[PDB]
Design a binder for this molecule. Structure first.
Ligand SMILES: CS(=O)(=O)N1CCN(Cc2cc3nc(-c4ccc(N)nc4)nc(N4CCOCC4)c3s2)CC1
Length: 841
């Protein structure tokens, strides 16, 4: 190993936030093997990407322009304003024109072919054989009434992304020797026993238990648990799952290892505890806290895996089963039917989840048939990719390598635009794989290595988990380290900049929190210190300029200490504001950023990403709802950063305006506020139209997700009329449609108007459009719960969204169902809003 090979690794370590060379917390070599595993996939992707297209990372889409953005072009001409230090001619361009082509009507329009269109003030480029209509920046401008400003500069040097050079028919059994903990005490001395489970996709194949013994600091069984399953019948991916009840602790051991060997010998496993179902319960990882943790002691002494058409009436049984939602439970009868008509089931892609849930993975012979089933995958391969279908196959119910592989195979066809919409959930999905090295992991790896925008967000999603998940940090760590070793020194440098900045600011964030009371107001002394610490940082600490983690196009510069401050909550976040490092920016506006420790922002990351998905759906059907899913990113334990949405105010503060009489409200302030922050009437109406759409979209999306019952506090509006929700960390009312909201639309307690009809129509249109993807939202929503909450109910909590999306009904009953929910809100009015407060005291 080189002397500067080890300075590389230690560089990596500090980016990663966890040291993958460490081997204190392993009982085998799976991770190191996975580090060696991923060297090929990486060096193939790095070896195959186009240096030029890679360096500029054009953000791009095949989807058609939606209806509602073509109406912003009633002339088949788009305006691009090219710049050059001072001057700038506005060039007239057809939606189908290529970057190279509109340089051909720029240079030819004057009277050297190696310049490039770069977005003014961002690290964004308009390049490669793509029609300008198909660039996200362009579409972004069209959606906002913004104009397309572009600067004529040089392509950046690919050299900046140089990657460096790297370097039996016996029944299974298991002796349970005993357990041992240093300190247990609670109050009374209860009994205790161990429960071993052979598991495969949350599915217990077999289960034994010890006699109970009294819970002393060391309990010793010296007992064989003979299982019914046989060695050969054990399927790759099967977890020996040891648990301790008196349910206190758990730990898992793969029974077949990353080399197909049968796990044999002595193991002393350090167990996880339960904070008194979710994805943590599955992890192959042991508890690294060897000093406080409970530990179980086992021994394994036990290589392997070495015509007729249907009578049209059962077909209708099948087809009804196939027609049911992912959280519909399959009865035994269902499964015997599905399985017996394998080859008929195979002709329906949507059937696969339900079909492979009907495999008996506890028998070599049936699995061997399941493998033969998959061998003829001609209907699947040719099928159109369905994301929700494909996801279902990657959740916690499917531990089979090949079942899982076929889903990954379908993802291959996603373009980056789409990978980006699902990346976070695809990352969380890695928690569901049995082995560290998996098709899914090599895919994520490969797609972020292929495109810097995905790479960037891969990083932060991986690092979010590493920083706070004992259960999955080691695995992610290995995946991340795989990536860093091929993202190229350009970005290695950019990530280092970002890690430093956020490390500095979290120090300041947490340091400030101590200084103020747990809850009351703003100490002048705290505003005094904050201003010093940031003046301290600004000089000989803070990197000249960093990329904004949630918006890597934007390079932040120096702070605006004058504008930075501590917020007026109970956790004490930092309103921070930054100059923009790019001097070609068209504007003077600041990069706003909030920094917060106290809420688990991972939840907020996830909910925001759904919102983003919902918008991509409404994009398919020519709908625009003006959701404002702001940037939000986790960085560590109960901590991270949030995008500041310029010009937004709290609806609550709009009622605190005068008095806010501990919980009084007044209807017309919201419309009155809008008039004030509108110069014309023209811009005021444009607000009411936006408030109508935003109000609609947040009403629908929030209702679907169960998070619709919120306070005015956690809801904001921009000056330009765009309502939005904040703060998704964990009588009743479905969504906020308070009498103030209805007033802006032009109504007050049981009446109708030209704009209220518009709201109703949109919600309905919008609501319906989500239901077209019912399956997708359900699988997301359920994955969400499992990988991103405390503990939860694998049926009940999920069940809500099923009821919500009004599963199994017809468009009219839905139209009706939601139109009832509206009517609930106009009946309650303030009664719930006013309630928060009543409980404070
Ligand atoms: C007087 S003061 O100290 O200067 N300050 C003025 C602003 N006011 C209200 C706000 C609260 C709030 N909370 C969150 C938030 C978001 C997520 C989360 N998990 N937790 C909290 N996000 C906010 N957005 C983010 C979007 O862009 C605008 C700012 C806002 S604005 C408080 C007092």
């Amino acid at each position: 190993m080189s002397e500067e090979s080890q300075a590389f690794q230690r560089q990596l370590t500090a980016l990663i936030g966890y040291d993958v060379t460490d081997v204190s917390n392993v009982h085998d070599d799976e991770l190191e093997f996975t580090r060696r595993g991923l060297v090929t996939p990486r060096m193939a992707e790095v070896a195959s990407r186009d240096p030029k297209l890679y360096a500029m990372h054009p953000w791009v889409t095949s989807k058609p322009l939606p209806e509602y953005l073509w109406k912003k072009i009633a002339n088949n001409c788009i305006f691009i304003v090219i710049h050059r230090s001072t001057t700038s001619q506005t060039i007239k361009v057809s939606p189908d024109d290529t970057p190279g082509a509109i340089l051909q009507s720029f240079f030819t329009k004057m009277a050297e072919q190696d310049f490039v269109l770069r977005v003014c003030g961002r690290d964004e480029y308009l390049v490669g054989e793509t029609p300008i209509k198909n660039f996200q920046w362009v579409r972004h401008c069209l959606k906002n009434g913004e104009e397309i400003h572009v600067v004529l500069d040089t392509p950046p040097d690919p050299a900046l992304d140089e990657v460096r050079k790297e370097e039996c028919d016996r029944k299974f059994r298991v002796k349970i020797r005993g357990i041992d903990i240093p300190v247990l005490p609670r109050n009374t001395d209860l009994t205790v026993f161990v429960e071993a489970n052979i598991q495969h996709g949350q599915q217990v194949l077999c289960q034994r238990r010890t006699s109970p013994k009294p819970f002393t600091e060391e309990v010793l069984w010296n007992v064989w648990l003979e299982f019914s399953i046989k060695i050969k019948d054990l399927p790759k991916g099967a977890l020996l799952n040891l648990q301790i009840y008196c349910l206190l602790y758990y730990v898992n051991l793969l029974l077949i290892d990353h080399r197909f060997l049968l796990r044999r010998g002595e193991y002393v496993l350090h167990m996880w505890q339960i904070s008194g179902f979710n994805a943590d319960k599955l992890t192959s990882a042991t508890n690294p806290d060897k000093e406080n943790s409970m530990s179980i002691s086992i021994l394994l002494d036990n290589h392997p895996i070495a015509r007729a058409e249907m009578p049209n009436q059962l077909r209708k049984q099948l087809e009804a089963i196939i027609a049911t939602d992912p959280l519909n439970p399959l009865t035994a009868e269902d499964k015997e039917l599905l399985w017996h008509f394998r080859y008929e089931s195979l002709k329906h892609p949507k059937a696969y989840p339900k079909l492979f849930s009907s495999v008996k993975w506890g028998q070599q012979e049936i699995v061997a048939k399941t493998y033969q089933l998959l061998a003829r995958r001609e209907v699947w391969d040719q099928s159109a990719l369905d994301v929700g279908l494909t996801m279902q196959l990657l959740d916690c119910n499917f531990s089979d390598e090949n079942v899982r592989a076929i889903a990954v195979q379908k993802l291959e066809s996603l373009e980056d635009d789409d990978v980006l919409h699902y990346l976070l959930q695809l990352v969380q999905a890695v928690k569901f794989e049995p082995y560290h090295d998996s098709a899914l992991a090599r895919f994520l790896l490969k797609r972020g290595l292929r495109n810097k925008r995905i790479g960037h967000f891969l990083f932060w999603f991986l690092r979010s988990e590493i920083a706070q998940s004992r259960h999955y940090q080691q695995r992610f760590a290995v995946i991340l380290e795989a990536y860093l070793r091929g993202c190229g020194t350009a970005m290695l440098h950019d990530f280092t900049q970002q890690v430093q900045v956020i490390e500095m600011l979290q120090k300041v964030t947490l340091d400030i929190k101590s200084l103020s009371a747990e809850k009351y107001d703003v100490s002048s002394q705290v505003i005094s210190q904050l201003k010093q610490k940031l003046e301290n940082l600004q000089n000989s600490q803070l990197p000249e300029s960093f990329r904004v983690p949630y918006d890597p196009g934007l390079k932040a510069g120096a702070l605006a200490i004058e504008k930075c401050k501590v917020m007026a909550s109970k956790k004490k976040p930092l309103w921070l504001e930054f100059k923009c490092a790019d001097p070609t920016a068209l504007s003077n506006e600041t990069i706003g950023i909030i920094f917060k420790h106290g809420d688990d922002l991972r939840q907020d990351m996830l909910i925001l990403q759904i919102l983003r998905i919902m918008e991509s759906i409404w994009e398919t059907e020519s709908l625009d709802l003006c959701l404002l899913p702001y940037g939000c990113i986790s960085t560590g334990d109960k901590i991270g950063m949030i995008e500041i949405v310029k010009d937004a105010t709290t609806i609550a503060k709009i009622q605190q305006s005068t008095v806010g009489n501990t919980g009084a409200f007044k209807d017309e302030v919201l419309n009155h506020w809008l008039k004030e922050k509108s110069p014309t009437e023209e811009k005021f109406q444009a607000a009411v139209e936006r408030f109508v759409y935003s109000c609609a979209g947040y009403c629908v999306a929030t209702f679907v997700l169960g998070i619709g019952d919120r306070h005015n506090d956690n809801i904001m509006i921009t000056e330009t009329g765009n309502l939005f929700h904040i703060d998704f960390g964990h009588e009743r009312v479905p969504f906020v449609l308070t009498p103030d909201f209805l007033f802006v639309m032009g109504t007050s307690g049981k009446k109708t108007s030209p704009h209220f009809q518009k709201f109703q129509d949109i919600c309905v249109k919008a609501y319906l459009a989500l239901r077209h993807h019912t399956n997708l939202l359900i699988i997301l929503f359920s994955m969400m719960l499992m990988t991103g909450m405390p503990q939860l109910t694998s049926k009940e909590d999920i069940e809500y969204i099923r009821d919500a999306l009004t599963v199994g009904k017809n468009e009219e009953d839905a139209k009706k169902y939601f139109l009832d929910q509206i009517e609930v809100c106009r009946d309650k009015g303030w009664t719930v809003q006013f309630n928060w407060f009543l409980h404070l005291v």
